[PDB]
Write a protein that binds this ligand. Structure first.
Ligand SMILES: Nc1ncnc2c1ncn2[C@@H]1O[C@H](COP(=O)(O)OP(=O)(O)O)[C@@H](O)[C@H]1O
Ligand SMILES: Nc1ncnc2c1ncn2[C@@H]1O[C@H](COP(=O)(O)OP(=O)(O)O)[C@@H](O)[C@H]1O
Ligand code: SF4
Ligand code: SF4
Ligand SMILES: [Mg+2]
Ligand SMILES: [Mg+2]
Lengths: 273, 273
């Protein structure tokens, strides 16, 4: 078996930084992991690959002719800890549906046997500002059974978490996609941990980890590395190791209870944010 | 004539706060303005209307039967300074295309004669994390001739500005949609104004105003008002008045020059962000 997980959240909240560091910690532990980038920004694997980014399936298919002219061994790339990496890509802005590349990529990976039994985890890093097209496909088509939402005390980040949860509820009659937890990627605000715990409880889930804001992230990323590789002794490396451990041990996967806008505002008012 | 403007930018960057305050300042000056909300969050008019939000055209059409059963006088609502307000709405998460309501709304407004000659400005407040579907329609279909992008020193906010600019370039052969400027909505970071000026120069535009981070915004919004209405003497009210004046006087509308990821990273490295 393998655990298929998707990391969702609003743009800029820390999906790719959190995913790549979490996965590096899992690889450091001895797990076999694949990351599938499902965000048009297409830099979801660069810290594993030590790279600028990664050429996308959409780009490589266009240069080869069709996606069938591609071979998996040409598309998947291995980096830190043997983690395997692939980017979906997507159409240029103003052209077609921004999520169309996700559908092409996941189908290609399935057909070509990328989901070999020896994998322990797959992580999809998915744009979450809209829940439609290819960005909804991991939920709609039962590709990621465990959804973890990166958020913060920012109202927009909490709204996004609630919106993603509404999408999970919409497809709960089929497949087995569930909300696994919230990950608070801190903005260094007071009581932020308490706020995200409260939100998770209202949704029916948990806050799986509170990730502190730490400048070591930027110093590692300037050098195209995870904190795990860049400075294994960093306090922030231990934070990502704690997040990885709790993801491994997590057994709570729920159909969430989306809340009203009044509930979100009350949370913010209460915790003095 | 009227000036048709659209405010784009990544989620949570300050589009709705900036738009409603800018428009309040324009109304305070004696201009006649309409705001069209083009973000599924659907709270782009609440500070003009003193409201929780506004019921959307998609919602009202469903309750009436068809969009043709709606009357403009039932849909448009007037608030502070006589500013007229309408919300597009959109499908629930996981269902259909998140931007579909924008197409329905703009077409309804055009057909029903909402664009009366006495209007001086129309502002569309548009989700910008993806540039596709109804979110691209104001650009693709020549609805907003002047695009202003709210951003900040945040890398993701600058990436979004570059992405929106790529969409403008894509449709420059038809219609007359142009980039009018960048608005820096500050994160209280050092040299942020210099950084956004540099980005604007690389794109071929200008930074039309630097909006400071000021807690008076939250105090006004808790009370469902713009800063302009809440505390007309606030320093931040004068900031929005300066932004409004410069939008009124702006004559630079360009086909932008999108930059490479290396250029963005160099900007960030240079200004020590
Ligand atoms: N815990 C953290 N501490 C410091 N910086 C962070 C942290 N998490 C993310 N960042 C920074 O935030 C920015 C956006 O993170 P990213 O993972 O790219 O967001 P997303 O993938 O959700 O768009 C990056 O520059 C990253 O270095
Ligand atoms: N200049 C500012 N100073 C302080 N808070 C701000 C400022 N601009 C925006 N905000 C706050 O940022 C949050 C997001 O702004 P909003 O306009 O809703 O973003 P968007 O419409 O782009 O999603 C709001 O809570 C708003 O009060
Ligand atoms: S939102 Fe992008 S195409 Fe439907
Ligand atoms: S991105 Fe939303 S439907 Fe195409
Ligand atoms: Mg990312
Ligand atoms: Mg808004």
């Amino acid at each position: 078996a393998m655990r298929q997980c998707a990391i969702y959240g609003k743009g800029g909240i820390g999906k790719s930084t959190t995913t790549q560091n979490l996965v590096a910690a899992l690889a450091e532990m001895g797990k076999k992991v694949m990351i599938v980038g499902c965000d048009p920004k297409a830099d979801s694997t660069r810290l594993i690959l030590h790279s600028k980014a990664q050429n996308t399936i959409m780009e490589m298919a266009a240069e080869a002719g069709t996606v069938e002219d591609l071979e998996l061994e040409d598309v998947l790339k291995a980096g830190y800890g043997g983690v395997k990496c692939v980017e979906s890509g997507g159409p240029e802005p103003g052209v077609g549906c921004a999520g169309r590349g996700v559908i092409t990529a996941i189908n290609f990976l399935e057909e070509e046997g990328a989901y070999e039994d020896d994998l322990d985890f797959v992580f999809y890093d998915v744009l979450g500002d809209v829940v439609c097209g290819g960005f909804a496909m991991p939920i709609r088509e039962n590709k990621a059974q465990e959804i973890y939402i990166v958020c913060s005390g920012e109202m927009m980040a909490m709204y996004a978490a609630n919106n993603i949860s509404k999408g999970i509820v919409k497809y709960a009659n089929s497949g087995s996609v569930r909300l696994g937890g919230l990950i608070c990627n801190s903005r260094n605000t007071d009581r932020e941990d308490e706020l995200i715990i409260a939100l998770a409880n209202k949704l029916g889930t948990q806050m799986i980890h509170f990730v502190p804001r730490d400048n070591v992230v930027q110093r590692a990323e300037i050098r195209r590395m995870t904190v795990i590789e860049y400075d294994p002794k960093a306090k922030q490396a231990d934070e990502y190791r704690a997040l990885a451990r709790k993801v491994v041990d997590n057994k709570l996967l729920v159909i969430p209870n989306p809340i009203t806008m009044d509930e979100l505002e009350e949370l913010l008012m209460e915790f003095g944010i």
